[PDB]
Amino acid sequence: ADYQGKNVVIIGLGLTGLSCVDFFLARGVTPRVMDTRMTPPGLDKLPEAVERHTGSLNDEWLMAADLIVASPGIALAHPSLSAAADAGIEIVGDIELFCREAQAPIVAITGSNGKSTVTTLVGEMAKAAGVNVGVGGNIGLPALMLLDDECELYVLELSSFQLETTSSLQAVAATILNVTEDHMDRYPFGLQQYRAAKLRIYENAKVCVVNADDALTMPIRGADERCVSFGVNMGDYHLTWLRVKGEKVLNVKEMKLSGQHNYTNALAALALADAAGLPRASSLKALTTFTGLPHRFEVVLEHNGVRWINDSKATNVGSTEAALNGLHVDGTLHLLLGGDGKSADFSPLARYLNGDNVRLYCFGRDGAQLAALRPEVAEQTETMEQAMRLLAPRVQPGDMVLLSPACASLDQFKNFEQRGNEFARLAKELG
Ligand SMILES: CC(=O)N[C@H]1[C@@H](OP(=O)(O)OP(=O)(O)OC[C@H]2O[C@@H](n3ccc(=O)[nH]c3=O)[C@H](O)[C@@H]2O)O[C@H](CO)[C@@H](O)[C@@H]1O[C@H](C)C(=O)N[C@@H](C)C(=O)O
Numbered sequence: 001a002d003y004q005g006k007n008v009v010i011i012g013l014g015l016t017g018l019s020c021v022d023f024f025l026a027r028g029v030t031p032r033v034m035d036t037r038m039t040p041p042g043l044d045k046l047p048e049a050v051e052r053h054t055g056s057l058n059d060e061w062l063m064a065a066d067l068i069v070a071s072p073g074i075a076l077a078h079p080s081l082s083a084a085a086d087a088g089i090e091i092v093g094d095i096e097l098f099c100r101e102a103q104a105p106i107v108a109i110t111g112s113n114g115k116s117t118v119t120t121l122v123g124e125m126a127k128a129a130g131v132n133v134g135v136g137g138n139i140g141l142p143a144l145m146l147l148d149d150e151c152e153l154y155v156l157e158l159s160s161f162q163l164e165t166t167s168s169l170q171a172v173a174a175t176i177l178n179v180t181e182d183h184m185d186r187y188p189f190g191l192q193q194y195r196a197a198k199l200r201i202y203e204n205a206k207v208c209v210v211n212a213d214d215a216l217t218m219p220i221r222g223a224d225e226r227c228v229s230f231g232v233n234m235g236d237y238h239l240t241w242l243r244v245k246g247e248k249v250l251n252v253k254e255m256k257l258s259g260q261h262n263y264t265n266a267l268a269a270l271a272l273a274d275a276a277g278l279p280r281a282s283s284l285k286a287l288t289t290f291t292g293l294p295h296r297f298e299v300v301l302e303h304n305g306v307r308w309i310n311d312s313k314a315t316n317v318g319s320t321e322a323a324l325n326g327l328h329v330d331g332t333l334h335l336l337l338g339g340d341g342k343s344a345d346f347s348p349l350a351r352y353l354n355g356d357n358v359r360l361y362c363f364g365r366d367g368a369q370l371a372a373l374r375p376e377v378a379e380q381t382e383t384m385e386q387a388m389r390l391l392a393p394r395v396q397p398g399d400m401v402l403l404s405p406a407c408a409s410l411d412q413f414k415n416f417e418q419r420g421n422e423f424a425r426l427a428k429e430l431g
Contacts, residue, residue, distance in 0.1 A: 034052065
């Protein structure tokens with residue numbers, strides 16, 4: 001889509017809002033942004049060129065917009081947004097922007113509780129088949145931070161909020177795991193209004209994975225030829241053995257998790273991966289190794305009042321930004337950055353590195369550019385080990401050593417997992 005020369009206004013300066021701001025700036029469009037909160041988390045992350053209004057909405061800005069991008073945290077029913085809509089001003093959310101740009105199929109997942117687990121599993125099933133997969137959305141990493149012409153499949157966890165502002169989603173496979181009322185303050189007209197939001201996920205979906213045990217997850221107008229279902233004792237995928245299309249496929253003894261819940265999660269996940277075209281071989285393997293939703297970070301050592309945190313999986317700028325958001329650091333943050341990154345996306349990261357309590361240790365191929373984000377507090381070495389031996393004598397009680405590289409590790413390691421193990425070993429010897 002073209003946004004050149006449009007008056008764009010973004011509502012919400014949280015993770016989503018910031019991703020949108022960067023999305024637009026990276027296309028030569030300077031948006032105006034607002035948030036009803038006086039000091040939203042992304043306020044100090046904006047470039048000075050961006051006009052901002054916080055503490056309330058600025059209605060003149062909204063009414064003068066060509067496009068309004070509304071974060072999930074504000075309701076379309078808000079009088080300011082209702083007014084803009086009546087005047088015919090287009091309103092979209094980050095997921096909508098994402099769908100317009102995506103060049104790979106999308107598996108979409110929504111429902112209430114357990115959403116993240118099913119999303120994560122589908123992601124693993126894709127990893128097992130060797131698919132460069134991008135997992136994001138409501139699960140944590142804003143969808144727009146995943147855009148990459150290298151990505152071969154996207155797995156998105158979506159909230160009813162994101163769904164209300166999305167119109168161009170055409171999922172290869174979509175599901176509403178269940179419909180259980182939550183966030184009802186955002187749906188004052190009842191369960192039907194609430195159900196309607198989730199149902200949007202099936203619009204133009206190639207295959208709709210439905211919950212045989214929850215009739216509300218069926219698209220309105222009964223189930224069609226696109227619908228495949230999962231359930232405990234009923235459905236295309238059901239239950240011990242996992243039954244699929246009438247044929248047993250796996251004895252639950254082969255998977256690490258147990259319990260009904262963990263089984264229907266595995267079934268819903270398989271139904272989605274089958275629909276997305278992933279080989280059942282690899283999907284089943286993933287089901288047999290899956291040990292659940294991983295922790296956000298791996299604490300490799302906590303000694304002398306210092307925490308050494310491994311987030312080697314943050315292979316891009318958006319992930320590192322996500323790791324830094326709301327990060328509690330009692331003393332100084334010794335941030336490790338480096339490897340093979342996407343230089344085109346480095347500039348915005350500098351805005352997350354301000355303050356008197358942050359030190360950068362940059363290494364690898366793009367270490368020089370990374371260190372250049374804020375030279376005054378950065379050290380530059382060739383390897384991560386050198387960088388760590390550098391910081392070791394410098395840490396004091398209360399500090400945090402964080403490996404959240406913002407780059408891939410292929411220039412010096414076999415994979416980010418190995419880079420993380422290296423970090424674990426070195427932290428134990430040095431901390
Ligand atoms: C509220 C919400 O939808 N949160 C999701 C959102 O995070 P983000 O930080 O971008 O949220 P936001 O839209 O800025 O809203 C955050 C908070 O500020 C408030 N808000 C937002 C804009 C504004 O003008 N005024 C205001 O008061 C919202 O009411 C909310 O209290 O985008 C992220 C990336 O997609 C999601 O991971 C994140 O999910 C969290 C984990 C969540 O609680 N989501 C709900 C929906 C859920 O899963 O139950």
